[PDB]
Structure 1
């Protein structure tokens, strides 16, 4: 009473996961390999709702306004032009 779905991890390995036929199959499955993988059948519905992580640039922007950054880069280049 089971249906078998196959997933493919980003590195190319493929894995067989037996499921119950009555149950709804997922589009991604944590795999014995340790990586996420994608079902080779139709869907494959969803992005999973990725929000980008916080970056150093983000933390600098919230204090220095872009103008202050520009004048600073001005100070720095005008110093490089003088050799």
Structure 2
């Protein structure tokens, strides 16, 4: 039989090569974890990353990251109740339930 893992290789070595320049950017975690990351000089620095210690969101040493609201927390039972029913129906069922409870 013949088989191949989807992996590519090159006839090439580490000796006798000059490495391109890189810059170390520092990131900090909420709990105090700090780490360094090497990036190419001809690169853009993203504002947010994941931590190398506890796998939580982390920002740069200098903070310039605001919050943009995401639109998909809506799903609850309350908003569906608003969508399905008007306020008067909820008020009258509420009044009936209080009446029977205090009865």
Distance 1:47 1:58, change over 3 A: same
Equivalent residue number for residue 39 of structure 1: 60
In structure 1, stretches of 5+ residues that fail to align are: none
Aligned residue pairs total: 81
Q: Which 4+ residue blocks in structure 1 deviate beyond 4 angstroms?
A: none
In structure 2, stretches of 5+ residues that fail to align are: 1-20
TM-score (normalised: structure 2): 0.60
Task: Please say if 1:24 is aligned against 2:24.
Answer: no
Pick from 10, 13, 20 the counterpart of residue 33 of structure 2: 13
Distance 1:22 1:66, change over 3 A: same
Bigger Rg, which one: 2
Pick 1 or 2: higher relative contact order, CA cutoff 8 A, min separation 6. 1
- Cα offsets for 1:25-76 (capped at 9, x unmatched): 11111233322112222422x4244224122212222101122111111112
Pick from 66, 69, 85 the counterpart of residue 64 of structure 1: 85
Distance 1:52 1:3, change over 3 A: same
